[PDB]
């Protein structure tokens, strides 16, 4: 009989971002006629008390952590993690655990106002996909063979750069 708790969503979906990236935290919840305020929390600290969304214009490493929201009808949400990194490239995914059959969208994100070319996405040290100009790598339907350590690399100007690795787990069922 108890109403659903609030839910936090990130737009875009990437849980890890680079400093200077913009992130919008959205709160899915219900409001009563006399109180439509939304409360946002960053690691247990209150950060906002009215708007349904919390917009981070230019992320900093200090923004990393757990975020939760709530309304006066939808209770405290489970936490959503945001990781903020510093580097020329970042391999992004909407999550790090996928079920077999699931599509996997990876993005080799370059730092604000830089452009990457000759990009390769690698899995367990082996090339999985190459693009002459930076593009995303979509794995149609995940199999157990997709579990592993992923990273991407390419060129920004004449500088060879490589992202940190991201470990992806595929669960059965
Ligand atoms: Hg904060
Ligand atoms: Hg996607």
């Amino acid at each position: 009989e108890d109403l659903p708790k609030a839910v936090v969503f990130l737009e875009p979906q990437w849980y890890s971002v680079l400093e200077k990236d913009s992130v919008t935290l959205k709160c899915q919840g219900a409001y009563s006629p006399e109180d439509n305020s939304t409360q946002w929390f960053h690691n247990e600290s209150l950060i906002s008390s009215q708007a349904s969304s919390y917009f981070i214009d230019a992320a900093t490493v200090n923004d990393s952590g757990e975020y939760r929201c709530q309304t006066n009808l939808s209770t405290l949400s489970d936490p959503v993690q945001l990781e903020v990194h510093i580097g020329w490239l970042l391999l992004q995914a909407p999550r790090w655990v996928f079920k077999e059959e699931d599509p996997i969208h990876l993005r080799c994100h370059s730092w604000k106002n830089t452009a990457l070319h000759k990009v390769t996405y690698l899995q367990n040290g082996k090339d999985r996909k190459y693009f002459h100009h930076n593009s995303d790598f979509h794995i149609p339907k995940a199999t157990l063979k997709d579990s592993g350590s992923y990273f991407c690399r390419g060129l920004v100007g004449s500088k060879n750069v490589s992202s940190e690795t991201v470990n992806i787990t595929i669960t059965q069922a």
Side-chain angles (χ1 to χ4, degrees), residues 2-173:
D2 163 293
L3 295 182
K5 70 179 72 178
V7 180
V8 171
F9 293 96
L10 301 177
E11 177 51 37
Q13 58 186 150
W14 322 119
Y15 65 83
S16 69
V17 302
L18 285 168
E19 273 213 359
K20 296 187 170 189
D21 283 351
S22 293
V23 180
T24 300
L25 297 279
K26 290 177 171 300
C27 188
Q28 177 192 78
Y31 307 97
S32 75
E34 54 297 310
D35 180 0
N36 48 219
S37 65
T38 290
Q39 286 75 242
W40 277 96
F41 303 89
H42 176 208
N43 294 328
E44 261 64 64
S45 289
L46 176 78
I47 59 184
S48 167
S49 305
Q50 97 81 21
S52 66
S53 286
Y54 188 90
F55 177 67
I56 295 176
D57 184 57
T60 70
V61 291
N62 186 245
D63 294 322
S64 298
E66 298 194 318
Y67 287 82
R68 294 181 186 245
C69 70
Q70 79 172 195
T71 66
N72 97 313
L73 291 184
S74 315
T75 66
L76 194 57
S77 75
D78 294 330
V80 166
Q81 253 289 321
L82 178 67
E83 283 173 24
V84 180
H85 299 250
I86 295 166
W88 287 87
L89 291 188
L90 184 65
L91 206 234
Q92 301 177 304
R95 55 185 110 281
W96 57 90
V97 180
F98 297 91
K99 304 163 194 161
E100 294 181 292
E101 243 66 294
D102 270 10
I104 296 169
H105 184 176
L106 303 177
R107 166 173 192 236
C108 191
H109 177 49
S110 57
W111 182 266
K112 201 176 179 61
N113 292 327
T114 71
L116 185 73
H117 298 84
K118 304 188 180 185
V119 180
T120 297
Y121 287 83
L122 292 94
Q123 172 195 5
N124 295 328
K126 298 210 156 197
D127 290 10
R128 276 294 292 277
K129 181 70 174 177
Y130 176 79
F131 288 105
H132 181 273
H133 300 288
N134 199 1
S135 300
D136 296 358
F137 175 44
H138 293 257
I139 292 165
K141 269 183 189 177
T143 69
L144 300 170
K145 293 193 179 183
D146 288 311
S147 289
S149 172
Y150 290 75
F151 79 101
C152 63
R153 60 176 175 222
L155 283 170
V156 172
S158 48
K159 186 188 174 63
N160 282 275
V161 295
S162 287
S163 75
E164 287 195 319
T165 53
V166 169
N167 293 311
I168 291 184
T169 298
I170 311 300
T171 60
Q172 210 152 43

